[PDB]
């Protein structure tokens, strides 16, 4: 009857389409390469039928064969134009279907000849969907071919809108071929970009603290043994010191070293550094003089807040401000004029494998964690919390900062009860301590101690393994590197597990389980744990190349992500599971 040119790159040469056309006594020329006008494949051709053809016909050809180029596209056009239509139909959750349409000078925008809806089951693999779609459109072609040949079908223009996808758009999703529709949409819900409407964080910590002071000014802020400071008292004293600090020339992004033991002065010093404008660099006096010297050297801290006791441990490294000298405190008790942005540094903490690296954290990083922490754990002014961790560690940021914005009362943990957890347990039972964070080691011990005061306890760092505890308090296992601010995931331990999961991401953060090629892994499949979102800090101080290494720009996505180097995977219920180091 007529000679037909069948164009395709993916489909076979024995399609139901080809054989059906051949059954009608058509000479079907099959071609799987890009052709030009001179091509012998275009000699005496009546109809061109394209089907998953991965090339564009020259406009010379499309005009010459106008109204005679038919294309089988397994999507409900205008939805999912271009490449991988079925995959993107499932992923973007668009209407499903198959479309036989005309070819124009653009990608899958030509007028429709025939079109019908298709349906994918929640249990179908994407390969099944791909096959079902091809099956459907092939049958449709065989059904409507006679109507198309005689040209009795009225072509109707596509609806406005739809979507388009290019060849490379599926690179990030190359491992999801055998995943189910359900599994795929689940992975989407877990790892897809944040929904619209969100705005950038617009507050610093000392802004929110100063706000909290005006709401609960006479409430106890911090307690050390028999002495205590209210929010108003703490604020005023921190202000007095902060005025003196800013007077010494402290400015945004400037580092200010603090070398003190756990005390009221430490809290005053920290808040004073913030309110002054700079970021505080905590230095444990019990560190070796070597690390202390290095920490002071690496950091650009021109100022050091410390005692006369620990004064000499710095060896005249910097201008010292004595927290016990009344001259170090100004008369002015008012809140200083704000000069900070949320992207200014708030603190620099060090993590020792090599020489210790100064992790840079910004205000918005800390604000996000605190703003998540308060409602998540339902913290109120009624609560009381321990300042347990060394203030050189990020666990102290949890202790001090999260509870101060909740209006709660901090309780300093002295040295005499740092190791004796039975004595600390007595303190907690006496003072009615309700919530706190203990490292995994210490937390596992506190389960042995008989406690009645606690309402919640939070653990993180090393691998949790024990769960059984005497008290009647909720147990929470968290996870996250210092580079991504304290913690990025949190789990409520309800049952015992051989591997206690580290939970789901906190506010404004996403965790992505990627393979070596930085492509998505299906739910339940192991891979490297990548962190994304508000938690990511500025990077390592004075280590730009190492920062570039660990804080990456994803090849496909282009988002800023932190490479943890940890091994993990998502459980079916969304909870993340830690699976040791990569090496």
Summed up:
This protein has 583 residues and is of the alpha/beta class. It has a domain at 2-191: Formyl transferase, N-terminal domain (Rossmann fold, 3-Layer(aba) Sandwich).
Entry keywords:
Rossmann fold; 14 helices; 5-stranded mixed β-sheet; 24% strand; monomer; 583 residues; alpha/beta
Percent of residues in helical segments? 25-40%
General shape: elongated
Question: What structural class do the secondary elements suggest?
Answer: alpha/beta
Strand order of the largest sheet: 2-1-3-4-6-7
- Radius of gyration (Å): 32 Å
* CATH architecture term of the domain at 2-191: 3-Layer(aba) Sandwich
Number of strands: 29
Distance between the termini: 67 Å
Give the CATH superfamily of the domain at 2-191. Answer: Formyl transferase, N-terminal domain
Under CATH at level 1, the class of the domain at 2-191 stands as Alpha Beta
Sheet-strand content, in percent, reads 15-25%
- CATH T-level topology of the domain at 2-191: Rossmann fold
Largest sheet: 6 strands, mixed
Total of DSSP H or I helical runs spanning 4+ residues: 14
Subunit structure: Large multienzyme complex composed of 4 subunits; LgrA, LgrB, LgrC and LgrD.
GO molecular function: ligase activity; phosphopantetheine binding
Protein name: Linear gramicidin synthase subunit A
Region (GART): 3-145
């Amino acid at each position: 009857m007529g000679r037909i040119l069948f164009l395709t790159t993916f489909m076979s040469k024995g399609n139901k389409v080809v054989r059906y056309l051949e059954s009608l006594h058509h000479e079907v020329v099959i071609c799987q390469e890009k052709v030009h006008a001179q091509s012998a494949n275009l000699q005496e051709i009546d109809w061109i039928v394209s089907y998953a053809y991965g090339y564009i016909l020259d406009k010379e050809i499309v005009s010459r064969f106008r109204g005679r180029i038919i294309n089988l596209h397994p999507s409900l056009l205008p939805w999912n134009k271009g490449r991988d239509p079925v995959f993107w139909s499932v992923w973007d959750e668009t209407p499903k279907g198959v479309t036989i349409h005309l070819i124009d000078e653009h990608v899958d925008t030509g007028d429709i000849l025939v079109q019908e809806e298709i349906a994918f089951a929640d249990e179908d693999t994407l390969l099944d969907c791909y096959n079902k779609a091809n099956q459907a459109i092939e049958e449709l072609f065989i059904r409507e071919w006679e109507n198309i040949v005689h040209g009795r079908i009225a072509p109707y223009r596509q609806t406005a809108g739809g979507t388009l996808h290019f060849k490379a758009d599926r690179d990030f999703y190359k491992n999801l071929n055998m995943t189910t529709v359900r599994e795929l949409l689940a992975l989407k819900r877990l790892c897809a970009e944040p929904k619209r409407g969100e705005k950038p964080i617009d507050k610093t910590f000392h802004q929110l603290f100063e706000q909290q002071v005006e709401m609960t000014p006479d409430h106890v802020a911090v307690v050390d043994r028999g002495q205590s400071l209210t929010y108003k008292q703490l604020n005023e004293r921190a202000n007095q010191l902060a005025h003196h600090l800013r007077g010494k020339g402290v400015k945004p992004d400037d580092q200010v070293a603090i070398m003190l033991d756990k005390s009221l002065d430490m809290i005053v010093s920290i808040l004073a550094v913030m309110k002054a404008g700079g970021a505080y660099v905590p230095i444990d006096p019990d560190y070796p003089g070597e690390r202390i010297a290095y920490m002071l050297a690496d950091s650009s801290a021109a100022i050091l807040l410390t005692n006369a006791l620990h004064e000499e441990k710095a060896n005249g490294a910097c201008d010292i401000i004595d927290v016990h000298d009344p001259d170090s405190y100004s008369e002015n008790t008012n809140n200083l004029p704000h000069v900070n942005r949320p992207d200014d540094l708030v603190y620099v903490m060090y993590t020792s494998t090599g020489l210790a690296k100064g992790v840079m954290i910004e205000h918005h990083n800390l604000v996000n964690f605190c703003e998540w922490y308060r409602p998540y754990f339902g913290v109120t002014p009624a609560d009381k919390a321990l300042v347990y961790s060394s203030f050189s560690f990020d666990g102290s940021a949890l202790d001090i900062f999260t509870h101060l914005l909740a209006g709660a009362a901090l309780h300093i943990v002295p040295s005499e009860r740092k190791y004796d957890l039975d004595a600390l347990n007595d303190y907690c039972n006496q003072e009615g301590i309700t919530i706190s964070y203990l490292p995994t080691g210490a937390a596992e011990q506190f389960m042995q101690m008989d406690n009645q005061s606690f309402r919640v306890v939070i653990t993180g760092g090393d691998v949790l393994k024990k769960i059984e505890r005497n008290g009647t308090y909720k147990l929470y296992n968290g996870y996250g590197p210092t580079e991504c601010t304290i913690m990025v995931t949190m789990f409520e331990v309800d049952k015992p597990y051989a591997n206690i999961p580290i939970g789901k991401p906190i506010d404004r953060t996403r965790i992505l389980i990627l393979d070596e090629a930085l492509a998505l892994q299906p739910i339940g499949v192991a891979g490297e744990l990548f962190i994304v979102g508000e938690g990511l800090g500025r990077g390592y101080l004075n280590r730009p190349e190492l920062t570039a290494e660990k804080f990456i720009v994803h090849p496909q996505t282009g988002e800023r992500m932190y490479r943890t180097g940890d091994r993990a995977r998502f459980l079916p219920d969304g909870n993340i599971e830690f699976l040791g180091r990569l090496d």
